[PDB]
Amino acid sequence: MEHVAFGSEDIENTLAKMDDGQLDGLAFGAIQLDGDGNILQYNAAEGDITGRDPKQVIGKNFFKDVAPCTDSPEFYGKFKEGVASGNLNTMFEYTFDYQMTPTKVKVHMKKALSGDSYWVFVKRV
Ligand SMILES: *C(=O)/C=C\c1ccc(O)cc1
Known part of the structure; x- marks a missing residue:
């Protein structure tokens, strides 16, 4: 068990080593x-x-292939703006519903310390 708390302010520093x-x-x-x-x-x-x-x-595309319910201004739209801006730190709730029982989650998206990488963190609420 790796001890890291969802939403921690320096989580990207922590996960870099992992x-x-x-x-x-x-x-x-x-x-x-x-x-x-x-x-x-x-x-x-x-x-x-x-x-x-x-x-x-x-290797697959999260928005196109894997998680198409995320292809929307409320999720994919934020990511694409964070990538354009190269800054992103946003937390919101969303319902995952593609080929699965609809599940409400908390999403946290944040830029990694890595130069062109982005994190999506997901926990149940
Ligand atoms: C909407 O599509 C959100 C999430 C998601 C992720 C994985 C799978 O398989 C379905 C849906």
Whole structure:
């Protein structure tokens, strides 16, 4: 178990040191995306929420392929503006509903310390 709290103010510093098998110890879902929304990392806790096998989603586009209910101004729209701006730190609730039981979650999106990477953190509410 890796001790990190959802929403912590220096979470990107914390996760920088972590390997993929370390990300799997987090109490919340964590996805790492490039600027184009392609999944670079995907932890086990997100797999528990969405039903995806984490290995099978790496390389796919989060907005186009994997999570199409996120393709909207309220989610994808924010990300695309954070990528354009190169700054992003936003937290909001959303309902995941694509090919799964509708589940209400808290999403936190934040820029990584990495130069062109972005985090999406997901926990149940
Ligand atoms: C809407 O599509 C949000 C999330 C999501 C993530 C994974 C899967 O498989 C479905 C939906």
